């Protein structure tokens, strides 16, 4: 087709953006950036369709042209910036902070956080190898590259990064017993804890997990995001629900119970 597409049709936009059908023909097309097109949430969606801070995209343009909006602390003006998993969005003018986290229903809930909290994030180790001049580095899930990591770090490990200096604070080894959070699949948004991992050479590795309530659920290894060291201790704040799935009758019961 002669070259790269620059438009995204509304019906072809990822469903986890909850874009209404009849608004118009097109959808925001997330720019090339740190996260994949499909597994990211562009800033215009975050700052318009979630927070209702803007009535439309022109006012989104105006808001970001005034250095208000920040991603991972740095200032961004790209209206279609592909904000993704673990990203921290700072709004100093409103005195408000956020972190993109998968709510259990499968989306990015509006997760408010504190200023002290809005200064770090987490990163899965894609690979570890030597660059030029023999210097070792590890690649994270957000396109960040860090040189001179701990000589023990391997793939599938989570690291803590400070959003100011880009430095690594502390990390996690991947093994049985780790609190995690599924990154894709049908088990999206739910928080579990590693039970077992089954290794298929040449294939796709399988990992067995368990929620706080006893539920064993398997998932592709590539969708496992370690979020802690043990059960009950995440390294970030969790949304209203703590990542446990509730059946439709359960939620209906709870809605009736709450409303009287």
């Amino acid at each position: 087709a002669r070259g790269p597409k620059k438009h995204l049709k509304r019906l072809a936009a990822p469903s986890h953006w909850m874009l209404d059908k009849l608004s118009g023909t097109y959808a925001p097309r997330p720019s090339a950036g740190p996260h994949k097109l499909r597994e990211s949430l562009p800033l215009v969606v975050f700052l318009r369709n979630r927070l209702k801070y803007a009535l439309n995209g022109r006012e989104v343009k105006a808001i970001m042209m005034q250095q208000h909006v920040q991603v991972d602390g740095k200032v961004r003006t790209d209206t279609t910036y592909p904000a993704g998993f673990m990203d921290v969005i700072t709004l100093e003018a409103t005195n408000e902070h956020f972190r993109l986290v998968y709510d259990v229903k499968g989306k990015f809930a509006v997760h408010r956080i504190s200023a002290e909290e809005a200064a770090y994030k987490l990163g899965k180790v894609k690979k570890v190898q030597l660059g030029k001049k023999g210097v070792p580095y590890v690649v994270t899930h957000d396109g960040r590259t860090i040189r001179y990591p701990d000589p023990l770090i391997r793939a599938n490990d989570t690291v803590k990064i400070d959003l100011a200096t880009g430095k690594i604070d502390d990390f996690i080894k991947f093994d049985t017993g780790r609190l995690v959070m599924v990154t894709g699949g049908r088990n999206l948004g739910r928080v579990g804890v590693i039970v077992h991992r089954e290794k298929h050479e040449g294939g796709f590795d399988l990992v067995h997990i368990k929620d706080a309530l006893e539920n064993t659920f398997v998932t592709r290894l590539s969708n496992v995001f370690v979020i802690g060291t043990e059960a009950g201790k995440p390294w970030v704040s969790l949304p209203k629900g703590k990542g446990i799935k509730l059946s439709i009758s359960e939620e209906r019961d709870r809605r009736r119970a709450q409303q009287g």
Binding site: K52, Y53, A54, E59, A62, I63, Q66, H68, L91, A93, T94
Partner: peptide, 8 residues
């Protein structure tokens, strides 16, 4: 449905 809108 009141939003305090300091950004604008």
């Amino acid at each position: 449905k009141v939003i305090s809108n300091p950004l604008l």
